[PDB]
Design a protein around this ligand. Structure first.
Ligand SMILES: *[C@@H]1O[C@H](CO)[C@@H](O[C@@H]2O[C@H](CO)[C@@H](O[C@@H]3O[C@H](CO)[C@@H](O)[C@H](O[C@H]4O[C@H](CO)[C@@H](O)[C@H](O)[C@@H]4O)[C@@H]3O)[C@H](O)[C@H]2NC(C)=O)[C@H](O)[C@H]1NC(C)=O
Ligand SMILES: [Cl-]
Length: 199
């Protein structure tokens, strides 16, 4: 129960334990009250091809600013959230964090006219240059082609780290990948809920 709250997964960048950060960079600002990411990690999240993963989102050339913003926010969420304990599964990762409907929907809307070449990003890239390239015969086409629904986008872009939830925002039953810093973190209560109910 309490074991699952206010912890950081054991992945390669995460802080051992969450704690306030005097400064986080831009999109990661929302987590600065209590974060699993360092300043350096928050900065690296914003680089053209983040050195955190060396996965290029620009593999089809056309990735729009509004689309990339959602992806940077996703990195901040993964790297900074102290509220993922309940979905930590075995050295750890996260599986099927329930993202609210609006988080998936807007992400999808803002990425429609960007281009990718694959639906299942978890693997099957041409990796020869040190960054991933589209494999042989994988056509660059709009995100709406490879991710027909918001749910496809959320789930497949991050190797099943996230699960698109039928629940909406402020329902207490799903997590937001980003939130306005003024408002305070809506995900604390949600993690508490899953923790208390033995999942
Ligand atoms: C994503 O890709 C980037 C780019 O390759 C990668 O960052 C690079 O990591 C390598 C190794 O981690 C860095 O190389 C080191 O550079 C320092 C100088 O800053 C050297 O002192 C190091 O020398 C020691 O280590 C070598 C083996 O790595 C030994 O052969 C050598 O004898 C020394 O003992 C070493 O060369 C490189 O500087 C960075 N490059 C950049 C631009 O930062 C990043 O790590 C990748 N991300 C992930 C998650 O792997
Ligand atoms: Cl959070």
């Amino acid at each position: 129960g309490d074991e699952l709250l206010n912890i950081c997964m054991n992945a390669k960048h995460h802080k051992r334990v969450p704690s306030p950060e005097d400064k986080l960079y831009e999109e990661c600002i929302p987590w600065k009250d209590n974060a699993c990411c360092t300043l350096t990690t928050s900065w690296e999240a914003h680089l053209d091809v983040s050195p955190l993963y060396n996965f290029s989102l620009f593999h089809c050339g056309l990735l729009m600013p509004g689309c990339r913003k959602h992806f940077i926010q996703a990195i901040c969420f993964y790297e900074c959230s102290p509220n993922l304990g309940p979905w930590i599964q075995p050295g750890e990762r996260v599986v099927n964090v329930p993202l609210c409907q609006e988080d998936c929907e807007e992400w999808w809307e803002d990425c429609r006219m960007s281009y990718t070449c694959k639906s299942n990003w978890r693997g099957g890239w041409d990796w020869s240059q040190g960054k991933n390239r589209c494999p042989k015969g994988a056509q660059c086409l709009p995100f709406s082609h490879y991710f027909p629904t918001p749910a496809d986008l959320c789930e497949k872009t991050w190797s099943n780290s996230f699960k698109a939830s039928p629940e909406r925002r402020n329902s207490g039953r799903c997590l937001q990948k980003w939130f306005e810093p003024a408002q305070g973190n809506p995900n604390v209560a949600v993690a508490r809920l899953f923790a208390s109910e033995f999942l």
